[PDB]
Amino acid sequence: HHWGYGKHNGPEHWHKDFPIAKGERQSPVDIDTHTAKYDPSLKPLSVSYDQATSLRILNNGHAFNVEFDDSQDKAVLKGGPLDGTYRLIQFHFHWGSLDGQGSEHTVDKKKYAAELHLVHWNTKYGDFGKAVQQPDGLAVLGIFLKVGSAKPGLQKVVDVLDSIKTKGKSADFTNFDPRGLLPESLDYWTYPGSLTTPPLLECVTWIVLKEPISVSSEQVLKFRKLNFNGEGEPEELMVDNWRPAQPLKNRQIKASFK
Ligand SMILES: CN(CCOc1ccc(C[C@H]2SC(=O)NC2=O)cc1)c1ccccn1
Numbered sequence: 141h142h143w144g145y146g147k148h149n150g151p152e153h154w155h156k157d158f159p160i161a162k163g164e165r166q167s168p169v170d171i172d173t174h175t176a177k178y179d180p181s182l183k184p185l186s187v188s189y190d191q192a193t194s195l196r197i198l199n200n201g202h203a204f205n206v207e208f209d210d211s212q213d214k215a216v217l218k219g220g221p222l223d224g225t226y227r228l229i230q231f232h233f234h235w236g237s238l239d240g241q242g243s244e245h246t247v248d249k250k251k252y253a254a255e256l257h258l259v260h261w262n263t264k265y266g267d268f269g270k271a272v273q274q275p276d277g278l279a280v281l282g283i284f285l286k287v288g289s290a291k292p293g294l295q296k297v298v299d300v301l302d303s304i305k306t307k308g309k310s311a312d313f314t315n316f317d318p319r320g321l322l323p324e325s326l327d328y329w330t331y332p333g334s335l336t337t338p339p340l341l342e343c344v345t346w347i348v349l350k351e352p353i354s355v356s357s358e359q360v361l362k363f364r365k366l367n368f369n370g371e372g373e374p375e376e377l378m379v380d381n382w383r384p385a386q387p388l389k390n391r392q393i394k395a396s397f398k
């Protein structure tokens with residue numbers, strides 16, 4: 141009886157195994173656009189993905205992860221609210237059963253169809269496992285997806301999903317350029333939070349882009365054909381793999397833009 145997104149093991153149950161689920165800096169949150177404060181001291185975000193080396197795509201039973209070589213400073217996030225250098229380790233998405241839900245963060249209570257998370261770790265902690273034990277260990281760049289025109293740069297991801305349908309399947313996934321998943325603007329909101337799955341560690345500086353990317357209905361329909369289950373188990377469609385908004389508590393969301 142392990143955690144997941146069902147009636148019996150979903151977010152409302154996670155606190156039993158992971159009491160930090162009720163902590164002081166949990167994610168995601170609703171972004172109240174009128175109460176976020178413009179912070180003119182926030183720097184532009186530096187996204188340096190020119191040298192990114194993708195390796196593999198994995199269905200881990202909760203999402204699919206596109207994994208990168210993080211053994212050198214090749215794909216790094218710097219600037220914005222961050223001190224020092226954060227290495228890209230993986231990206232994944234959260235999405236819904238319906239276009240009207242799927243994002244983890246919300247904007248004035250609006251749910252997007254999906255949310256992309258580019259996960260980066262602070263190089264001053266040496267490895268990802270050490271970084272998650274630190275309050276400034278990770279930087280996650282969150283990007284909303286809305287359904288409209290196709291995202292050309294997403295299609296290579298969409299087309300490999302047939303090969304990783306079930307939990308524990310992986311495939312080669314080299315030479316994927318994550319710059320093709322970014323919107324035009326790097327305007328962002330930022331706040332201190334957590335991993336949005338168990339172990340729910342309070343180690344993340346969240347950077348959520350204001351501008352969504354557009355993906356087509358066909359692209360997100362292919363996400364929804366993935367399975368939570370392993371091969372030869374009853375089919376459970378991988379849909380609604382999002383944690384809902386958590387209490388903001390004693391936090392301020394800052395805007396990089398007026
Ligand atoms: C290091 N580790 C393994 C898991 O740590 C995680 C890091 C990120 C994620 C993905 C989350 S965070 C986000 O933005 N969206 C997600 O889905 C999940 C687990 C540990 C460390 C201690 C105990 C157990 N495992």
Ligand SMILES: [Zn+2]
Pocket residue numbers: 232233234257336
């Ligand atoms: Zn995530």
